[PDB]
Amino acid sequence: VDAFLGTWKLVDSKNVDDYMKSLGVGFATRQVASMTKPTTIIEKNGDILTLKTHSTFKNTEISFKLGVEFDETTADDRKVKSIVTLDGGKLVHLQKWDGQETTLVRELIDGKLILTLTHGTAVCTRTYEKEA
Numbered sequence: 001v002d003a004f005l006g007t008w009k010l011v012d013s014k015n016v017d018d019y020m021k022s023l024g025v026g027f028a029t030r031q032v033a034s035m036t037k038p039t040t041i042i043e044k045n046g047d048i049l050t051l052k053t054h055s056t057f058k059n060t061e062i063s064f065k066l067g068v069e070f071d072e073t074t075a076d077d078r079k080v081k082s083i084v085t086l087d088g089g090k091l092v093h094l095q096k097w098d099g100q101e102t103t104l105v106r107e108l109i110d111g112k113l114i115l116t117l118t119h120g121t122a123v124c125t126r127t128y129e130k131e132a
C-alpha cells in the first residue's frame with residue numbers, strides 16, 4: 001500500500017453528478033459537491049490505514065485494516081458495511097447497505113491517483129495529484 005500514502009488534491013472529475021444522483025443525493029448537495037475540490041490524506045500506522053477526506057463542505061475520516069469489515073457512515077449519511085482490499089495493485093473499497101453496493105477503486109497511473117466510483121449504471125472518475 002505504500003505508494004498510496006500521502007496527501008492528494010483533486011484536479012479532475014467526470015460524472016460526479018450522475019453518481020450522486022444514483023445514490024439519492026439531493027440537488028442542493030450535488031451543487032456544492034460539483035464545485036468542491038477535496039484533499040485526501042492516506043496514512044498508515046502498522047496494519048491500520050487512515051483515510052481522511054477534507055473540504056470546505058464536509059470532512060470524513062475512516063480507519064481500517066485491509067480485509068476486515070468495518071461500519072462506516074458516509075459523507076451523504078448512509079450507514080454501510082465496508083471492506084477495503086488490495087486487488088491487482090488497486091485499493092478496492094466496497095460499501096454494502098440495504099442490498100445495494102457501491103465500489104470505490106483507487107489506482108496509481110503515471111503517478112496520479114485515479115478514483116473510480118460505481119453505483120448502478122453510473123460511473124464517476126476523479127483524478128488526484130500528489131501534494132509534496
Ligand SMILES: CCCCCCCCCCCCCCCC(=O)O
Pocket residue numbers: 010020025029033036038040053055057058059060074075076115126
Ligand atoms: C467529501 C467531499 C465530497 C462532498 C460530497 C458529499 C455528498 C456525496 C458523497 C458521495 C460519496 C463520497 C464521494 C467521494 C469522492 C472523493 O473522495 O473525491
